[PDB]
Amino acid sequence: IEQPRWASKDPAAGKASTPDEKIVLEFMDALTSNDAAKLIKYFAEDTMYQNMPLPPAYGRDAVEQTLAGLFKVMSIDAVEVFHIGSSKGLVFTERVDVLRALPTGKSYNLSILGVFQLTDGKITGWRDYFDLREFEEAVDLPLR
Amino acid sequence: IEQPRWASKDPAAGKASTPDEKIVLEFMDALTSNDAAKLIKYFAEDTMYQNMPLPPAYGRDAVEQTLAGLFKVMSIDAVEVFHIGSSKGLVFTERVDVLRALPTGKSYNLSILGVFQLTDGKITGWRDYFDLREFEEAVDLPLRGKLGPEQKLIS
Ligand SMILES: CCCC[C@@H](O)C(N)=O
Ligand SMILES: CCCC[C@@H](O)C(N)=O
């Protein structure tokens, strides 16, 4: 993953500056496990997950199942966070996830902006925004 | 615009707490002008804009052209920011813009996560992330087929 032309040049732009930012970067590192049971440990009970072009999941079991499902069809091969910032209970990541569609073997660098809500270091919400059609077209797989 | 089920409950979650956050919320208020010439005043020289499903625009004239082109076929009728946060030189907004397509009169509450890069309070980058197809289907217009080739001319 190469730094988009528009990435902020300061190395600090992609690094954590708070406890909550640090947790979210640890979670970003964990994604390439492709392991829903590993990832669910980061979540609060009262949580949700949504890839914004697709329906949301509420509660941990649904979030874990949704992740497990995604990992049956696609792999996260690599994550690079270009930009991170925050407010109380909120962290944002502008990143690229390199995603490989297992039925076709084709990969795509997915440009994602994500938001994480936190309480006491645990994820109460995770929403990723991106264009689904562009991804489908790149890996020759209708996902919707 | 009603607040999504998942919005942070604290009232401060969508309120600015820094000078850069404040400028970006001024900019969000300005969007409903539908006026590219007003909006371009917030931009640095060394700047870019991109709606992530379509090609980027570099430099102020291209950014202004891109906004003007959008405003010829859609109106921003309302903006609500649910969540805002930041770092040095960076502001993020999770929001809804209510977009009305002029050719069909149809409106859509477009769910957007956007990032702004700043230098001494001027915008050096603005990228909005959302799903284009859902928006096209709601307002019954092939937007990419129109705006993608226009965005390619701008570049
Ligand atoms: C439908 C794309 C889902 C992508 C997700 O597992 C990711 N890379 O965050
Ligand atoms: C192609 C949709 C662009 C929407 C944009 O003018 C906005 N509301 O940020």
Curated annotation (Swiss-Prot), chain A:
One of its GO terms (molecular function) is limonene-1,2-epoxide hydrolase activity. This is Limonene-1,2-epoxide hydrolase. The keyword Repressor does not apply. Induction: By growth on monoterpenes. Optimum temperature is 50 degrees Celsius. Monomer. Signal peptide: none annotated. It is an enzyme of class 3 (hydrolase). The active site is at D97 (proton donor), D128 (proton acceptor). SUPFAM superfamilies: NTF2-like (SSF54427). Catalyzes the conversion of limonene-1,2-epoxide to limonene-1,2-diol. Can use both the (-) and (+) isomers of limonene-1,2-epoxide as substrates and also has some activity with 1-methylcyclohexene oxide, cyclohexene oxide and indene oxide as substrates. Belongs to the limonene-1,2-epoxide hydrolase family. Pathway: Terpene metabolism; (4R)-limonene degradation; (1S,4R)-1-hydroxylimonen-2-one from (4R)-limonene: step 2/3. It comes from Rhodococcus erythropolis. Changing R95 to A/H/K/Q: Impaired protein folding and no activity. Gene3D superfamilies: 3.10.450.50. It holds the Pfam family LEH. Its EC number is 3.3.2.8. Disulfide bonds: none annotated.
